[PDB]
């Protein structure tokens, strides 16, 4: 089902973000809970045996089950509809050795389910294979993501690669002014500060203070995008010794929903750092920690649904996310005569590390999720 599978998909991907985050420590990290959910669902089809059970358990749904793929493909068409003014461009690709004898009916079946095809390449032509892979991403992310560092691992022994790449760029329901954007010190998690550019805006924001069962307090602010189709939620720790990991490690779609129910509109002056960050992840370590170890093993991996004669296994599972946040009419050239604005009761300055979550409002899909430590 629709919002059902979107939630199983989002939750799984967040579970994947927790792993990437517990590894990144104090590095800025952008990730797409949706992306890794979309691709892993496709890979379910190329698996069999234990390698398949480990993934359907990790994700929480069999891709061949009634309404799973139909709901998933309906979702994709929704995100890529006409409202999306090139705000989010994505691409999911599975590259297998072309010389490999495939199972009778895998390609036809895969297409019917995803309306996409598994890519074939002759991995013996290393240079060609890598170019072909970094090129697919390019042409299919509207030229936003044209390279990968991980492809540098594709060699002769490679027979299978998984790739996922997303690009996201706002377009707020109410653009942050421009003349208001200014310099402001940001408190990095070590007492050190840096003069970073921040956007400012007074208006009626949807806010809520949030406490985790653990007792951590966060200022939660929802920031809508044009048409309320998307919303970027901001979870900024209360004091200063409050980590992001206290929230991100208990995060789910039901938690975002929770914020919405307790949310209220207060007239504040929001000061938000403008950030354009990029992260590339080697999904292997994080996927293994979620219980998916077999797929990465030379003798254990079981992809007999993609081909039954083979010593296969994913040689490279990765993701690349490019997130940008600005005024949306961002001249950005380092600042005329006047600047006016309506006054607000209080201000909410985001000058310390914080985490954000972008969601598809109609379905509550957790599209993007990050931890911004130093903009």
Residues in the site for Cl ion, rule: CB under 5 A?
A: 145-147
Return the H-helix or E-strand segment holding 118.
none
Residues 75 and 363 sit within 8 Å (Cβ to Cβ): yes
Which neighbouring-strand residues pair with 97?
A: 121
Q: How many Å apart are CA 48 and CA 283, to the nearest integer?
A: 20
The three-state secondary structure class of 191 is coil
CB 200 within 8 A of CB 176: yes
Angle between helices 2-24 and 49-59 (to 10 degrees): 100
For Cl ion, the closer of residues 98 and 147 by Cβ is: 147
Cβ of residue 139: shortest distance to Cl ion, in angstroms? 13
Which of residues 141 and 365 has its CB atom nearest to Cl ion in the complex? Answer: 141
d(CA 322, CA 365): 18
List C-alpha distances in Å: 353 to 87, 159, 367: 24, 40, 20
Nearer Cβ to Cl ion (147/274): 147
Query: Residue 149 CB, nearest distance to Cl ion (Å)?
Result: 9
Q: Smallest distance from the beta carbon of 161 to Cl ion, in angstroms?
A: 17
Two tokens at 180? 């208001």
Neighbours of 272 (CB within 10 A): 27
Min separation Cβ 202 and Cl ion, Å: 36
Within 10 angstroms of residue 174's Cβ, the number of other Cβ atoms is 14
Find, among 12, 140, 134, the residue nearest to 88 by Cα. Answer: 140
In the bound state with Cl ion, the residue whose beta carbon lies nearer, of 74 and 147, is: 147
Comparing C-alpha atoms, which of 204, 99, 71, 233 is closest to residue 158? 99
In angstroms, the CA 82 to CA 66 distance is 28
* Angle, CA of 68, 74 and 78, to the nearest 5°: 145
| Minimum distance from residue 145 beta carbon to Cl ion (Å) | 4
- Residue 73 or 138: the one with the smaller Cβ distance to Cl ion is 138
Give the distance from CA 170 to its chain's centroid: 14
What is the secondary structure of 43-91 as a DSSP string? HGGG--HHHHHHHHHHHTS-TTSTTHHHHHHHHHHHHTSTT--SSEEEE
For Cl ion, the closer CB: 135 or 308: 135
Minimum Å distance from CB 322 to Cl ion?
7
**Chain residue whose CB lies nearest Cl ion:** 147
| Residue among 69 and 132 whose Cβ is closer to Cl ion | 132
Query: For the chain, what is the radius of gyration of the CA atoms?
Result: 22
Cβ closest to Cl ion, residue 8 vs residue 145: 145
For residue 151, give the DSSP letter.
G
Supply the minimum distance, in Å, between the C-beta of residue 358 and Cl ion: 20
Write down the least CB distance from residue 30 to Cl ion, Å.
13
Q: In the complex with Cl ion, which residue's Cβ is closer, 147 or 260? A: 147
CB of 147 to Cl ion, least distance (A): 4
């Amino acid at each position: 089902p629709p919002s059902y599978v979107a939630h199983l998909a989002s939750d799984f991907g967040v579970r994947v973000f927790q792993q990437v985050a517990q590894a990144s420590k104090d590095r800025n990290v952008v990730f797409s809970p949706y992306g890794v959910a979309s691709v892993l669902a496709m890979l379910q089809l190329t698996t069999g045996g234990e390698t398949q059970q480990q993934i359907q358990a990790a994700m929480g749904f069999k891709i061949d089950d009634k309404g799973m793929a139909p709901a998933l493909r309906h979702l994709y068409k929704e995100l890529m509809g006409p409202w999306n003014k090139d705000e989010i461009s994505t691409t999911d690709a599975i590259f297998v050795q072309r010389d490999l004898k495939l199972v009778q009916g895998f390609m036809p079946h895969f297409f019917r389910l995803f309306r996409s095809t598994v890519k074939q390449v002759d991995f013996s032509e290393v240079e060609r294979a890598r170019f072909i892979i970094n090129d697919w991403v390019k042409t299919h992310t509207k030229g936003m993501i044209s390279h990968l560092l991980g492809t540098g691992a594709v060699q002769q022994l490679t027979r299978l690669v998984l790739v996922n790449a997303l690009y996201f760029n706002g377009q707020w329901k109410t653009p942050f002014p421009d003349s208001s954007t200014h310099r402001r010190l940001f408190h990095k998690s070590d007492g050190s500060t840096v003069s970073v550019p921040m956007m400012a805006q007074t208006n009626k924001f949807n806010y809520t203070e949030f406490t985790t069962p653990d007792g951590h307090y966060y200022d939660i602010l929802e920031l809508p995008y044009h048409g309320d189709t998307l919303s970027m939620f901001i979870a900024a720790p209360y004091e200063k010794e409050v980590p992001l990991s206290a929230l991100t490690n208990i995060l789910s779609a039901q938690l975002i929903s929770h914020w919405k129910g307790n949310m209220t509109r207060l007239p504040r002056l929001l000061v938000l750092p403008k950030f354009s960050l990029e992260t590339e992840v080697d999904l292997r370590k994080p996927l293994e920690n979620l219980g998916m170890t077999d797929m990465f093993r030379q003798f254990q991996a079981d992809f007999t649904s993609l081909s039954d004669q083979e010593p296969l296994h994913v040689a490279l599972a990765l993701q690349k996310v490019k997130i940008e946040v600005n005024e949306s009419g961002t001249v950005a050239s380092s600042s005329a005569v006047i600047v006016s604005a309506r006054m607000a009761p209080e201000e909410i300055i985001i000058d310390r590390p914080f985490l954000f979550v972008v969601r598809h409002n109609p379905t509550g899909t957790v599209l993007f999720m990050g931890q911004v430590m130093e903009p």
